[PDB]
From a paper:
[name] consists of 4 functional regions: [name] homology 4 domain (SH4), SH3, SH2, SH1 (catalytic domain) and is activated through auto-phosphorylation at tyrosine 416 upon SH3 ligand binding. [name], also named as KiSS1R (KiSS1 receptor), is a member of the GPCR superfamily. There is a PR motif in the C terminus of human [name] ([name] CT), which is conserved in terrestrial animals. Here, we show [name] recruits active [name] and the phosphatase [name] through the conserved PR motif upon activation by the ligand Kp-10.
Two main SH3 domain-binding motifs, proline/arginine-rich motifs (PR motifs), have been identified: R/KxxPxxP (class I) and PxxPxR/K (class II) (where K is lysine and x is any amino acid). By comparing multiple homologs of [name], it was observed that the SH3 binding motif was ubiquitous in the C-terminus (CT) of [name] in terrestrial vertebrates, and human [name] contains the most redundant SH3-binding sequence including two class I RxxPxxP motifs (GPR54336–342 and GPR54350–356) and two class II PxxPxR motifs (GPR54339–344 and GPR54345–350). C terminus of [name] ([name] CT) interacted with the SH3 domain of [name] most obviously by SH3 domain proteins microarray assay. Of note, [name] CT dose-dependently bound with [name] by surface plasmon resonance (SPR) analysis, and the binding affinity was calculated to be approximately 2.6 nM. We were not able to co-crystallize the SH3 domain or SH3-SH2 domains of [name] with the whole CT of [name] or its PR motif, but a chimera construct embedding the PR motif (333–356) to the C-terminus of SH3-SH2 domains yielded crystals that diffracted to 3.54 Å. Consistent with this structure, SPR showed that [name] bound with the peptide of GPR54336–356 with binding affinity of 4.24 μM, the binding was only slightly reduced for the N-terminal half of the PR motif (GPR54333–344, 28.27 μM). Consistently, by pull-down assay, the R336A&P339A mutant of human [name] CT, which removed the N-terminal key proline and arginine, dramatically dampened the interaction of [name] with [name] CT, and the △339–344 (deletion sign: △) mutant of [name] CT completely abolished the binding of [name] with [name] CT. Furthermore, GST pull-downs using GST proteins including GST, GST-[name] CT, GST-[name] CT (R350&P353) incubated separately with WCL of 293 T cells transfected with HA-[name] or HA-[name] were performed that GST-[name] CT (R350&P353) showed no loss of binding, which also significantly strengthen the arguments for selectivity for the first SH3 binding motif. In addition, immunofluorescence (IF) staining assay by total internal reflection fluorescence (TIRF) microscopy demonstrated that [name] co-localized on the membrane with [name] especially after Kp-10 stimulation in pre-osteoclasts, IgG, [name] and [name] only are showing as control. These findings coherently showed that [name] bound with [name] via PR motif after Kp-10 treatment.
Numbering used by the authors: 87 to 247, 333 to 344
The structure:
């Protein structure tokens, strides 16, 4: 029944709540379309939070490496950062196939230099995800936990989560 914060937010009014990314919140009243009343489980503060800054706990949008409907052009811009080591990755929605996802990872080939590898993740009719038929998965979170321990078909193992994600615009009310 808990939620989790996706970004950092600073209080603008006297009735809203300031919170940092990763803060676990408790939605106590969601009878409001834009701003919900939440109780921070870590700092103990209560206040109104923007509903777009949070996502349900153990959901797909709540993961730090899930970036949503970011385009391929915009996905390479985050991974091509010089700070990102080899293996910096993110999971985006497949713009070609609805319901599918793409995995964009940063890679260093000695022949092409720094580059970005894109692997499309296919959704089974049963609800499963896979990149190759040799290994199938049920959810994207556990898929990342595999390819983060061993490469296994990928040019490199998943390492760093892509940081530097702009905070979305707070909705007015």
């Amino acid at each position: 029944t808990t939620f989790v914060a996706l970004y950092d937010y600073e209080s603008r009014t006297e009735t809203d709540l300031s919170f940092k990314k990763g803060e676990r919140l408790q939605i106590v009243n969601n009878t409001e379309g834009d701003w919900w009343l939440a109780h921070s489980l870590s700092t103990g503060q209560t206040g109104y939070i923007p509903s777009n800054y949070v996502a349900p706990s153990d959901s797909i949008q709540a993961e730090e490496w899930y970036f949503g409907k970011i385009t391929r052009r915009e996905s390479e811009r985050l991974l091509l950062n010089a700070e990102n080591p080899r293996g910096t990755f993110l999971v985006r929605e497949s713009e070609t196939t609805k319901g599918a996802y793409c995995l964009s990872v940063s890679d260093f080939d000695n022949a092409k230099g720094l580059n970005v590898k894109h692997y499309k993740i296919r959704k089974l009719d049963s609800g499963g995800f896979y990149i190759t038929s040799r290994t199938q998965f049920n959810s994207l979170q556990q898929l990342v936990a595999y390819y983060s321990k061993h490469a296994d078909g990928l040019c490199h193992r998943l390492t760093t989560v892509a940081f530097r994600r702009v905070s979305p615009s707070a909705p007015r009310r």
